[PDB]
Amino acid sequence: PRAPRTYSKTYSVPKRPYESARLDAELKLAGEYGLKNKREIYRIGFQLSKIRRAARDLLTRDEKDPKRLFEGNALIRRLVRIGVLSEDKMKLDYVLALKPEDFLERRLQTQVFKLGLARSIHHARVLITQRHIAVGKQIVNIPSFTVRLDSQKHIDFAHNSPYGGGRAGRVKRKNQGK
Amino acid sequence: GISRDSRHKRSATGAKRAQFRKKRKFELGRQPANTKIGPKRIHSVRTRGGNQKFRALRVETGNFSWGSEGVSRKTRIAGVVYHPSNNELVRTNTLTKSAVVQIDATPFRQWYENHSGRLYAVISSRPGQSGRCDGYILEGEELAFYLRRLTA
Amino acid sequence: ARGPKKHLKRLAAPSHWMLDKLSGTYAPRPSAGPHKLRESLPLVVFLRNRLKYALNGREVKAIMMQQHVQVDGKVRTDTTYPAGFMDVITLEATNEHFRLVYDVKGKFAVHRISAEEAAYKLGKVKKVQLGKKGVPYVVTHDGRTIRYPDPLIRANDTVKIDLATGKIDDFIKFDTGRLVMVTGGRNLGRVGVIVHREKHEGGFDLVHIKDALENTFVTRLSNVFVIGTEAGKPWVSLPKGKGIKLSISEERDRRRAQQG
C-alpha cells in the first residue's frame, strides 16, 4: 500500500491528577493567558521539555564538538527567531533557564492584546477566532500562532474585516438596512 | 517427483527435520537411463532453461581414442566386462561411465597397417547425459590393473 | 518467487531518485540495460522528476514516443530505459545535452554539457579476456564490449569511447596520481587523486583518495572511477561544486551568505 503518514502527540498529562499546587499554578496561568483548557499548558510544557532534553544532550557533550556546535546554534537561532529567548542569552545555558511564560508571551492572542487591538485577552481570542486579525497580508485565525519578531510589527486588522476597513458585518448591515 | 533436496534428510546431529515447504521443480530428478547394447535409440528430454539432454537407452557404436597414437575411430563395442560400482551392470551389459568395455579392433588394426579382434576400453562419456558411449583404450598400468581384476 | 519481479514499491525505490512518499504506491522499475538497477536512473524519473519537462507519465510516454530522447546516440522509446553513470542524453529539439555525473552530495547532478562533449563518454574497463577466434575484448562499466583493444589495456583502466562508432579513442592507465570519482558508498560523488593503493589478496582492494581540500578517505577499489590523467584535469566536465566535500557547518555558512 501507500507509505504511512507520520503523526505524533504534542502533549503529555501529569502523573498525579489531583495536586492543589499544580492545579492552582495551571489554572492561574490559564486565567492569565486566556487559555481554553489545560492541554494547551501540557503542550507548552511538552515542547519546552523536549527543547530542554535537546539542550541537556548537547551540554553533556564536550565543548567545541562539531555536532554540539551545529545543532545547538540551530536551536538557539530558532528560539531567538521565534522570540522566546532574548538576544543577550545565546549561551545554551539560558535555554534550560527558559520558562513556559516565555513561550506564552509570544502567542498571537498575547501579542494582539498587548498591542491594543482588543479590550482584554478574551476579546483577543474572540477577535482571532472571528477572522478579524491578519499578520502581514495573511489572515490567521489560530490563537496559538506563535508570532515571530519580524512578524510582530505586521499584526493588524484584516483589510476585509469590519474593524479593518471592510464592509459592515451581518448585524450592522441588517440594522442600517432597515 | 524425485528430488535432490536435503530437506528430506535429517541433520548431522540426528534431528528429524520438519516439513518446511512442498517440493520444488528447480531440484527435481529423473530416472536412470540404463544404457544397453542394441539399435541406436535415443530420447531427448526437456531440461531446465531450454537445454536438451539425450538418454542413451541403447547404443551399438561409439568413438574410441587410442591415447598412444592420438587416433580416434568409430568402432563397434562387444559388451561391458568390469564396473567398479555394481557387478549387476557387468552381468546385464549396462553401459555407463567408468565401465570397461570391449571394442571392435578392425579400425585400429587398419590404421596401424596404413601407418583377439576385441580391444578393451573405458567409457568416459555419460550416455545418460549425451547419448554417446565415447571412451579411450587401456594402456600401461591401468590396463594391468583391470586385467588382473578380470582374470583373478 | 516463481520468476523475476516486475514492480517496485515507492518506499523501496533507491533514495537518490528523490521520489516523494505520498505520490503513489509504486515507483518506476528500471528495465534491464547497460547499468545495474541500484546504480541507474530511469528516463521517466530523469525527464519528469528532475528536469520537470513532463508533468506526468502520460507526457513522458508521449515525449519518448515522438522520438525526442536519445541516450548515447541511439533513440530509445522505452519509458523505463535504465540510464546510468556517464551516459549522455541529448535532446536536440530543445538543444540540450546532459551528462549524468554524481555530485558530492550523492545524487545525480543535472549537469548540462555542450554537444561536442556530448559526442563521447568514458567507461571503466572491468575485464580483459579472449573472445571467440582468440580475439581479445574489453568490458566497460556500462556493459559495452569493445573488440580489438590496445594490448596495453588491463582491468580497472578507463577508455574513452567515440560513442558514434563504438571504438576506443584513447585510455587512461590505472596508477598513482590519477583523478578518480567514487561510484559507491558514502563517498559517492567525491573526486580526488590516488595517493597509495593498498592491496588485499582474496578480499577487496582499498584505494586511498585525497580530496582537493587535502582530505583523505579510503574506499573499495570497486567504487573507484578514473576520470582524469592528473589533478585538475578531468576528461569530462565536473558538476557544480567540483566534488569538494564541505562540513555541514560550512554548508550552512555558505547557504546563509548566498541567500543573505
Next chain:
RNA sequence: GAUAAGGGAAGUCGGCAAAAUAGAUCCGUAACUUCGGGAUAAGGAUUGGCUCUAAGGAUCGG
C-alpha cells in the same frame, strides 16, 4: 474319518467335540515384576525352481 452356501456360539450347564495357529529367517513386543521373568507376549513380512555372485579354510614353497 472327511467336506459344506450365508451367518458365526443364536446350540449347550458349560465353546463339550471340531476348526483355526503351527517349522525357519527377519522386524516388533504391553501391564506387572520377587528384576530372574512375563515372552514364542501381542502383531507383521518372507519361504519353490533355476542361473549366478560374494564371504568363511588346509598343506607346501625365503
Next chain:
RNA sequence: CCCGUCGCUACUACCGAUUGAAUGGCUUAGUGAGGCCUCCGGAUUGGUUUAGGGAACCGAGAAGCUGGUCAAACUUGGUCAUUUAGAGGAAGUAAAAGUCGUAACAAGGUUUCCGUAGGUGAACCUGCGGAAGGAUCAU
C-alpha cells in the same frame, strides 16, 4: 486468645472398576488412485513413393500393454498429546460459630519445639536422640 475430630451446606482438585470415551499428529503392515519414465503395441494417415490388375515398403502416430518411480486415500496395529464420563474413597477451602474436649500462648497449670516409632474419639500421649526459639548466660 485458641486447636482438632464429628455433624450440616457450598466449591475445587485428586484416586478410582469401566482391557472407559472422544479429538488431533506421527508411524509398522496390507490394499492402492493418478501422473511420469520405459517396453512392446500399431486404430488411421501421408507418401522414400513403385506398380498394368496394382504388389509393395518408409515415416508420423492414438488407444492399449510390460516393468519401474513419486505416491494421494482407506483398513488394522502401535505410540504421543489434549479434552471428558464414572459407583465409591480420601483431602482442601469457605459459611456459621452446631457437638465433644482444652492441645498451644503465663512454669498455659506435664516447659515448648525438631527427627523417628508406636498408640489413641479428637486436639494429642508416650519412648529414644536432639534444640533453647527457656522458666537458667552465674555458685
Next chain:
RNA sequence: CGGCACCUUACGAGAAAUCAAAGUCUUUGGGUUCUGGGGGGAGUAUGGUCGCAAGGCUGAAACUUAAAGGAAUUGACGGAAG
C-alpha cells in the same frame, strides 16, 4: 604463631534485638556455590528415581485469602521470682 572463647566501646552496620562481624553495603563491584519472591492449599497430588519396608530426593496446579510475619514499647494478666 595457631586454636576454643570472653570482657569494654561503637568509628561503623542494622527495623531492632544486637554484631570485631551481621563492619569496610545509594561514597552501591575481591573470588565463588546454594536458596527465597505475601499467607495458605503444600512438601500435598502426579510422573520419575533410590529403598526390603518405613520412607528419601525432585515436585505442581485448581481453589482461597488482606494480611501472615520480624524486633521492640506501654498496659492487662500469670496456678513465676523479689
Next chain:
RNA sequence: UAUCUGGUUGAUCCUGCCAGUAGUCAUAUGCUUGUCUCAAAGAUUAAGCCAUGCAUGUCUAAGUAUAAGCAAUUUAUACAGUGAAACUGCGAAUGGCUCAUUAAAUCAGUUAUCGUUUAUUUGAUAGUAUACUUGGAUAACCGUGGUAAUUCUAGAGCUAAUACAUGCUUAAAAUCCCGACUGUUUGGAAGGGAUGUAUUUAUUAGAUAAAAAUUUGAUGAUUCAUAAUAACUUUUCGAAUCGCAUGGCCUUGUGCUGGCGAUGGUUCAUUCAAAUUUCUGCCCUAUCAACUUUCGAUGGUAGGAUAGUGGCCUACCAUGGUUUCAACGGGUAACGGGGAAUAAGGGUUCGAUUCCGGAGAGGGAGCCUGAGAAACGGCUACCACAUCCAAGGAAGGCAGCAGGCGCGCAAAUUACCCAAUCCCGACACGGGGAGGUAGUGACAAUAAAUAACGAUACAGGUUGUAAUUGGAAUGAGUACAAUGUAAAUACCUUAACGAGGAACAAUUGGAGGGCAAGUCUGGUGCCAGCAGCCGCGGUAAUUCCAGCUCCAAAAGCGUAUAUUAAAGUUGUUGCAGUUAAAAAGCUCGUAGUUGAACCUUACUUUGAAAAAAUUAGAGUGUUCAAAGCAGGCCUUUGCUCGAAUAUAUUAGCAUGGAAUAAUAGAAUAGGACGUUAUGGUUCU
C-alpha cells in the same frame, strides 16, 4: 519529573504484598459528540463455509485478411483504408491476500558460485566450400448434427503464414589427410576427400630466477579463456519473413544494383532473476539425557540423476556424526526482520498488520507448457465439503475486491474511475477491484467554537464580578456561483440568509481517607445498596438513593483485560537469606567461574558496512500545528538554495596501539647466527 500514597498495631519501626497512580502503533465496551486536516478497519475466535458480479489480456505503416463487415472510387483487377473472427507471438510465474505450518528451519548482517540455469533489455558476433524463392495440412468461414446440461465438440467442403516440415545462392587464398605417377639422397606430384558454428570424447600450447661452454591473455588460485590434432552426431543454425520510400548506371531490360526500418537468430558479455552456500545470532521446558544408523545416519571410492555442488540416490566399504558450553524431544494462545509501547541509565513487553525475506491457496500428492510454476483466478487423482440433472451424466476452490452465513468482546459499500502511481500486451490508442475517488468510520493523531465589549444598579477594592439594558462580531448550518474532480463529494473562496434564554442549551466521573471537591436538605434504617483498598449503612449517614452546591478532565469522560513505569516486588547496573521467605547435615569432586609477583590472540581506536520507511535532527510561515519535501526571487517567454546528518551493532572485513588478560618458546639442547664460514647428498 530518576516522585510515591492508603491498608496488619492500644501505639511504633520493619519485611511484605493488596490497593491507589500514568502511558500504550492497545483492544473491547458505556455515556456523549459542533468544526478543519490526517487516517486504521473480519488479524486474534473458525488456514471455518461461500450465492452473485468483477479482478488478465493484448496490434503497430511493419506476422497471416475473399468477414458473403463498414466506406470511397482510387496512384491501383492480386491485395492495399478501417476492421470483427480465427491462426501466430507475448503475457498470464507480476500484482493482491493471509500467517496455518515452521525453533538452525525461516530470517538478519556478512560471504561464495574456479559449483550452476537465466525469457527479456543493452553491446558485440556468423562469406564455409527450384533461387525470379520449396511442400501439405489446419483455423476462422459455408452447411449437416448430438446431448437437459458446460468456455463439449464430430463428420463434409475450402484457404494463409515470423505456425509446421524442408532447402540453395559467394570472395580470395591457405592448411591437413589419402595418394596414381615421378624425381631418385628423400624432393615434386595428377586425382580423391575436409575446412564456419554447435555436440561428445582423447591428446597437446596455454611459458616466464638473474651471465658463461621468434610468439604466448587473465586470476590470490584452476584441467580458466582460447587455440590445435583425431574422430563423433536419428546434424544445432550460417533470414524461403514483413512496412515505408523508390534512388543510381546505361550495352533502352520488368536488366544490374540499394536507403531507413519490423521481427528473428548462434555464441560471448551485461542486466532483470533463480538455486545452492560461509560465519555469528532465535522464546518456554530436564516431570526431555542421550539422539542418529532396518529402510542414509558420519565418512571413503565409483557411478546414476540434476542446470549444477552435495548420501541427492545406487553399489561396495569403514563406524562414524551431535551432546550438560544443553544435543535430542515436547510446548508455543511462534512467520523472521526493519520496527512499536514504556522507559534516568540498564532494561521489560509487543511485532497477524503499509517495507524486505519466507511459505500457502480446503488437506496431501503428481505433472504439462514455458526462460521461469511442483502454479492452483493451470490440469490429473484421492479424502472432506459442495452445484445442476431428464439420475445418462456434468461442473468446483474469495487466505483477491465487494458481498452472505457462522464464530465470537471484536472489525465498513455487492459504489465511481483508469484522471494520478505504475504494470502488462504486437501498443502513442486496449486492459488493470494493482491502484486511485467517494460511502460507513469517536481505532489513534493535529488544530480548534460553545461567546466578546460598554452603561446602570449595587457590593467591592484608580477597577473583577454579581443582575437588566444596549449596540457590534462571527461561524456551525444553508446556498446561488467559481474553484476543486475522470465525473462528483468534501475542503478553500464568496452573493443572499443564518444569535439573547444568543433552547444553535457539554459531557463523563466524583465530593470520609487514598484523592480535588459538603459534616448541606429530603428518603431508608445492617434493608436497599455503595465501596479497586481501608471502610460506610442498626432512626441528626461527610460514604447509600435524590435535590442544591462544589471538584477534575472536556469533545471528550468512565469501565475491563494485557503490558510498561511506579517495582531496588526479578535487583548485571541494583534485592534479600541470625530472628520476617530463604546457607545444602558435613566433607570430597568433574564441567563452569576466578586465579600471587616478575621481563598466536583477546581487547581498544579509526575506516568501510548496517535498504527504504520509523527515531533523533538541519532547512522550509502547510494561515499555526500534526505534517509534507517542499519552495524562493518585480512578477519574470526565466533565474534560482534544497531534499542535510547522526544513530544502527552482535558477526565478518581493513587499520593504529602492545597497557590490561591469556597463549608459544633454548634443558637428554632436537637451540640461534655465520650475512661472502668449510666441505658432502641431492632437486629446479
